[PDB]
Amino acid sequence: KVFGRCELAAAMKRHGLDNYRGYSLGNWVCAAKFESNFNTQATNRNTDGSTDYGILQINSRWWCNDGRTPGSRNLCNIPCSALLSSDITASVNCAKKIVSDGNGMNAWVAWRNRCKGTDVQAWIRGCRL
């Protein structure tokens, strides 16, 4: 599924991401935009043998288990295959644990490259929330 900007902002607000651990809603919408382009099916294999899954590109080496990645830790204790639903529930629950580490949203490379430092609030502007 491919969310519309405002559609996801409302979904993420409902899923408790507005001001979660110091990160405003715009951060998450912007992150989804550049990590998966709002696509819940996004799947990208990496150089280190891992793969990023879902709307928020959760990594198989640290967060979810895909059973084919070297040195898997599965911190979110969930199969990567379970993070590809149209229902963002599972990716949000895992995203919250990820950002609860001292590294915060820096875990999301695209967010770090395209959102951090920008007017993230712009991503929720012009939306009914």
Partner: antibody, heavy 113, light 107 residues
Framework: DVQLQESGPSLVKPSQTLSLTCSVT????????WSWIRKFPGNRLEYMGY???????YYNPSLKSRISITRDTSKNQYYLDLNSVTTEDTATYYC???????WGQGTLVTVSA | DIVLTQSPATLSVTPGNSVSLSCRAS??????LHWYQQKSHESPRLLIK???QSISGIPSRFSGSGSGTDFTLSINSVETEDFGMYFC?????????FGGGTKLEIK
Amino acid sequence: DVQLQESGPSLVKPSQTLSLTCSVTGDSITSDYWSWIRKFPGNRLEYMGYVSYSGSTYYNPSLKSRISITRDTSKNQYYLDLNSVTTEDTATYYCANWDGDYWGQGTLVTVSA
Amino acid sequence: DIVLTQSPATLSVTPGNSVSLSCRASQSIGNNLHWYQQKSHESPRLLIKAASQSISGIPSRFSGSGSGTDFTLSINSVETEDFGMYFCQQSNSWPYTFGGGTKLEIK
């Protein structure tokens, strides 16, 4: 299955450092975030802090920077240090994983002269 | 810090009746509220996470609802084993905080 178990002295002196150990069985500590919570006499619960995978820590400001949470992978356990304790630190200490699915049995630590 | 208020702090009920416990936060916490049950002499037991998400192994009669600053833990047909303390905890902002707790007592 995963099991948590606190251990350490139950009686400590004022001004000393209170230290406890949480032994994790059933899985590796490298697969979760780990916290310490304590309950005071009166049904008052206080979240002390936790250590995440990167080793970064978050401590409750109420502890006034007297707390330290560390880990030891080879022993599959993590620890709690609370410096310069006072009778105000007497409570039941529990270790639990970050999301709260697993809790230790809790251990009463009394601070007395 | 975020202050969680659980009022009434004590609730008297007859087994079989349905009750709701309140937890209000001093500032919005989205859906980041967890409900715990703590029977005397025992470690807390997580009943509901993320305000309304069910937990495997927990009786079905327990459910949670709410968002923002007002949350509710609902018990459908209270059982004797349910008597005890119930605490809500927020994880939206650090430091994580607990409500003062609500004690479920028989009439």
